[PDB]
Ligand binder design. Structure first.
Ligand SMILES: C[C@]12C=CC(=O)C=C1CC[C@@H]1[C@@H]2CC[C@]2(C)C(=O)CC[C@@H]12
Ligand code: NA
Lengths: 508, 505, 508, 505
């Protein structure tokens, strides 16, 4: 009846999953990791691998003036008392996770400056998040070729480009090497959770599609589901009311289709926040997909009425939420990013992946013109309003103050701007034609709604009771952060901590 | 009838071109740089930016036991006395080029291990070549977006990926920043050399297509042509007898079409070595192009007869030359690289760009099968010979010695592998694959004949006043050899520097 | 009559002087540099060599989001319109000075983070100042031994310690090499300006003591006096009303005695701001001298009444000005810095030079005790008030807020604090005895009052007319900054810019 | 009866001690480190932190052409077969020590050029030694203030000067951070080993003076004694026949008084090489102490007869041994270093600490004069012989050859000089100076006899169960030789590691 057996079964292979697998296997529990696709890492592999794990040994090594209490204060100020026990667990457990992981020879992190996202008590203007060190692929043997490549390769039919592995690729490559090095773990690809197996009300294993045949895998201590969210499932998204679209999502196409969330619902798990995501603006691509637009450093953005309606330097989640809030039947989705030839026709932001302007212009996702009047005609924006919007923005750039949306009055805004700008580095006149308009959509970096869990990642029913044997973390679980993206690395940070805590709970 | 005027006119924007431009502009000479395409850097931007500039302050900072004389000895042992004065100038001038460049705040290099390519007196088993440090694109302002991206982006309709600029992108980004910082240089894109202008036998400027209109640009001290070779021009290649093909060349598509070489011929410049290139094996792509295959660490390679015929770990240029030497009317071009599923279906080498196996298999550039017999059928190799070739190779892997081609008896071979011999691994865990391998290049190396200061020479050895060439616009001093990593950029940089110094006299 | 002749005669050898000398000699003017002592560099050699030269090529190479207009805006917000033409000249000329200097093979700078000092529009929280790169002494031949050593060597009978030359030593070593490399400059030590020589109302040279003989040196284009301020002259200081004391000054003992200022007065030069200095708190030394106290990270400070009266994390100039403002006949000079044994008896700040606690305690500059009551007795502070002051501060540390002086509500305050948990990194309880009290005095990093100059460094008479042939910069000139120390590197930055401009003017 | 207990008790806090403590605590053994003074690091903190740990991952990252066998060959050629098993263990274990340490986030090293000290097979002319990276003190929290400061601060009543921590301060700061980070170690200052405690013939702990009260600390696996040598104990030195003097030693004043060696003798430990030290010339200071003189780049040295008697560019240990060999009742100790005003009155060498010439001249340690005749009078050297010695040296400088002592015929000699021979410079531009030079040391190197795992041995070669020694508490495997930069720290680190590994079995 059972095909194989282990102490801890982990579904998924993102940062959280592999951290949970490591925590279990490092303390002697046999572990099996199941990855649906032919590559480990999921969206985590795509990530910059910034991780919000504050007040740990890593920041101490950088002399950073911060602490557990300062971080706790920051979360409380943003989130309120909703999920305060989970906020506490997140912050307090960070040091221990980092310490455990850094004990492994394959893992080292460092602090990297990148500001927290909201003005509030406890904010770090330079940030407090950490990153895995760049990784020479030869140092993890055959595992490197099993890591999912960066977006600029993975959506163009390519594997890893010739540099070292960095960001998400370093994170996942290092985590895989550490998991393997325990000698207690089995890492499987093309292995898909189908449903959970319950005996006497306790989750005791799972049914799994692999090699076209069904398997039943027994989990003596428990099952950690960290298999992403619903971002790739248009139906579940429509049903929940999630904004954006599956095709605009920056998750790997077809990977995160809400399987683990559904499997948990099927055994009694409650859910929450299904209409929420980790939002971001996306540059629409020729093929209908999107690219993560981050680090805006010029231009402005208008609705279909040719009017500005938000601070374009806002952090990506807040930018996205502002698009959705303003949207009336497609009036803000798409929005149009307007810019001049200051950067040779480049869009003044970082786009991931980074499709050449020529390709966008061929396809009509972007449009160019010698005057704002033509640009309006070609995009359907009112000519007079566009013209007017730009003149007004340019006036604001000259004075160095944006009275309307207060762009450039925040360290996040300033962090990305190049030198020799002007009075305000975030406000630069749009005036040296040709002029361009790029379509911007409501992308995501994964959804953040899912199964309700407690401080140790146990999945809960509607009455708050724990489903024995079942755990969830990362975007399979409803995030403690609610409607907020507090700073860089929260999605990976929360995924990693609660995967660790769930593995610790299974070890008791 | 002059549109504009300058002291030094530089055609091209590769490593050499920008080094020449910097050398001129740093000492006060007004300089104009003309790049044909919309991006600076050419093939140099694609490069790993390893540079063979031995015995300089950079290697001293790394405590490297090497010297000018040791490097000279290495070149003499490989190349003989052919072009010995240029060998001497190359080696002796390296320190000064590096010193000048590193005085600019935007430029720093470091030593990076990568072995020289031939067993000979003066070889460095760990290498002596240097590289520019990684560069944060925000540190050179608007120039970063004007640098040609890496191959893995540039042939898939993409710009720079999110990391730092490294290799050729660091080299060109840093060189551009240094050239701009002089305040004496004008950097132009979409500006194409059409022909040279001569008055009383001296090159005094050039005719240039830009903005759809013709321009005439005056060069008081001279014209440095470092606009690449003929690699992208099938006609010139066929006429010269150059092996390989334009479509297989790793140069940027349509950029290096021999324009500067032709313009030099047109005014009396002699040429040499036009049938030579910087060769490399290439993995054939679905669209007919190729990818640079370097750092082989497994598999074996067979001709169309299903037989091994070379050491597959040879340096890329020597590998290429071996393909050409063995080729009888397509018997070795293509060759087939045979490998198993040890790396999950990946090919056991570094391929640039790195197209996924699935794409190759969909297109038929690669072919897969559960047995060697089916693999033979699907590729048109003899089944018996293939089967036999593999069994024999696997025996050699087990013993740790390849008696037939001596693979794995050299530090280059070992450098890319952490078994009895790291370079010899049995092919046995199906599915099995065969990938088509072609005769690619990293640019051609034939061109205008020059002297030690880069002056272009006529057939009688006299110098064409006012005209200079370096990089692949010039015939390389290295003849039929690729001595070690970084020679193409190294020679381009030194002679571009020396030409600028000559124009300054 | 004339002993020798040159185009440009430079008096002094600090950062300004050598920058002026370079600017002249690089464009073909014969130059003679006169240094009073046996070593080049003065207080500039002692410095950290942070230089406030905003919006230049150096910051562009670090991607810094700042500009000339932003820096101008910062100065205007602090200084008002007093000296606005000089503010403009300072900011606008920075790029050209840096460019000229970096064109020399011996000179390179880099940006280094260190915050600006006042909350105001145009502030850089991370800073915008630059520094010379560390220098291997072998790279400038015999010149290295002619540079004045750092404070931690120069006041203890020592020459350079074994590392590379850094901070001020790098600055002066590199500047000297660049000046020498022109082949147009003569660098002299033990050569003292005595007085200026005037013919038909124009300064045409100077009288100079060297080798015990008097010399008369002719200056065809002019004389640049950048020979420091009056900091080492108790008489001039007392006459002008300058706070602090010569003995407490961090300038080299006996070097900057106001000679150039006096020589300028003697030929009609007006003066201003003679009662102002670049102030800082100083840790009183056994021998009566002081040490620059910067980067406070703990403790508190009380007046003679045992009460706090300032934010102890203030920038050093502001801290100093607060000491002087509060001082009533020695009630705040000295003040007492109170701290516990958290750092093993070390004082929680950077002190330059860094005299060991044992030496202070032996001499009585510092005093230690097991209880605050004894500590009070031994220092003459009221026991009740001290006890009370500390309890209240410790309460504030526990809450993480200092309601009384708002310490730790500013990026400068936070910049120096180590991670030590705690709600606020700048507030740490004083509680683990023994307890110590260190005497703190009103030190300086030079005075800033002097000869009135225009935008090209010409010395002016009371009516604003220019004294033909005479220029001043650095602390020989009255600073454009008035009563403010805007940020790190202003003293060197102003000295360098106006020395450059003066040399350019002489070249016309 | 026991005050506290641990698995591994380490006495001392130099590079060896902390490496041993780390090796133990990193693999889960509870560790207690005892430092006698109020600061960690001892002489190791003073050091340049050059470390002779050849053939490791660090040198591979620098592309250095060297290996374990090459280094072994070097040691064998110098030392012979005396202690060959320990030579082997030293060389073979270097990679593993470096690898373990560099796995800690707080530790990173890099190769830094500095030549090996003897002409012999296996020598590296550029060196093979490594150094810890410079360290920002804020990165190790409260530990920075617990590291002993550099000599130029520590003997003048000062703490750390304002730069980053470098050399020995970086080494010790980084090692302390790594030891603390394990969470298995307790670091104690002002805790002095008094004597060892033995039960049933096995060392099981130690008695320790701390806080004016005696403590007894139990060591379940063992006691590593790495508490320096006898350098600061004039009695033990005189008894053993050690040349030089305690006050001239560059160790911290009063720290290394041979306590651990005596404690080991008291329980049966044999000793060897007590008359040997890591010698160096020292510049005599006004207060009677000395300063390490290294990197001589000019001048010459005479005995009290006004005659040269050695190559002044010899490595410091060889220089010292030559002073001792020539000494007849003070005829060479002191010697006089003679130099001109080429460097403005500076002495042409690096001196640590670096006392100003004015201070020496006030005190009469140095003497200056306008002629060699006056200089001779003021120092008591024969005028004729001095004059004659200098003329002859200046002739040798003009030819570029020193026939008498062969100065400047070796890469060490040249390394410190940027003339026909860079190491030979005429002494001719007055004023002239004579500085007194004495026989200093960088610690003594005699001590307890140990085996390849650092176990302390009795006279018959049997191991004293539970007792280990490394660094200068142990008799060095190097005998009468200082092979190259970093041997003292290198040996201390390797055998401390091995001892901790042996305790872990
Ligand atoms: C000579 C020495 C000492 C003992 C040893 O074993 C190895 C070395 C080499 C490194 C130098 C050090 C002495 C101090 C030096 C000169 C520095 O201050 C910088 C480099 C250091
Ligand atoms: Na790509």
């Amino acid at each position: 009846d059972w095909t194989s057996e282990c102490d801890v079964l982990v579904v998924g292979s993102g940062g959280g999953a592999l951290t949970g697998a490591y925590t279990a296997a490092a303390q002697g529990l046999t572990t099996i990791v199941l990855e649906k696709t032919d590559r480990f890492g999921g969206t985590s592999a795509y990530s910059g691998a910034s991780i919000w794990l504050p007040g740990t040994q890593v920041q101490e090594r950088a002399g950073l003036p911060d602490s557990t209490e300062n971080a706790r204060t920051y979360l409380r100020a943003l989130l309120g008392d909703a999920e305060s026990e989970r906020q506490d667990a997140y912050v307090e457990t960070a040091p221990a996770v980092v310490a455990l992981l850094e004990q492994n020879p394959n893992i080292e992190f460092e602090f990297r400056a990148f500001p927290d996202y909201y003005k509030a008590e406890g904010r770090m203007d330079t940030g407090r998040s950490i990153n895995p060190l760049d990784l020479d692929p030869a140092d993890i043997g055959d595992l490197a070729g099993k890591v999912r490549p960066e977006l600029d390769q993975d959506r163009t039919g390519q594997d890893h480009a010739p540099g070292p592995m960095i960001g998400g690729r370093a994170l996942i490559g290092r985590l895989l090497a550490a998991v393997q090095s325990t000698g207690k773990a089995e890492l499987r690809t093309e292995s898909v959770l189908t449903s959970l197996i319950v005996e006497d009300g306790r989750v005791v294993g799972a049914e799994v599609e692999s090699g076209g045949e069904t398997q039943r895998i027994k989990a003596n201590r428990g099952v950690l589901m960290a298999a992403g969210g619903i971002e790739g499932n248009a139906e579940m998204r429509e049903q929940a009311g999630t904004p954006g679209k599956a095709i605009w999502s920056m998750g790997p196409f077809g990977a995160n289709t809400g399987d683990a969330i559904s499997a948990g619902i099927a055994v009694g798990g409650a859910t929450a926040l299904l209409d929420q995501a980790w939002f971001c603006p996306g540059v629409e691509q020729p093929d209908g997909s999107a690219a993560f637009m981050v680090g805006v450093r010029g231009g402005l953005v208008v609705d279909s009425a040719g009017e500005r309606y938000l601070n374009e330097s806002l952090p990506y989640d807040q930018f996205g939420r502002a698009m959705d809030a303003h949207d009336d039947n497609g009036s803000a989705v798409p929005s149009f990013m307007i810019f001049d030839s200051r950067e040779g026709g480049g869009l003044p932001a970082i786009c991931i992946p980074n499709t050449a302007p020529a390709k966008h212009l061929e396809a009509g996702t972007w449009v160019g013109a010698d005057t704002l009047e033509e640009l309006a005609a070609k995009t359907g924006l009112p000519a007079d309003a566009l013209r007017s919007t730009v003149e007004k923005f340019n006036d604001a750039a000259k004075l160095g103050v944006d009275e309307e949306f207060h762009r450039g009055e925040d360290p996040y805004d300033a962090f990305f701007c190049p030198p020799n700008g002007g009075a305000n580095a975030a406000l630069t006149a749009i005036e040296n034609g040709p002029f361009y308009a790029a379509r911007i959509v409501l992308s995501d970096l994964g959804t953040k709604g899912g199964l309700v869990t407690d401080v140790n990642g146990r999945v809960l029913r509607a009455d708050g009771s724990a489903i024995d044997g079942l755990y969830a973390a990362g975007n399979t679980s409803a995030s403690l952060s609610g409607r907020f993206y507090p700073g860089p690395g929260v999605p990976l940070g929360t995924a990693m901590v609660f995967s660790y805590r769930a593995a610790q709970d299974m070890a008791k």
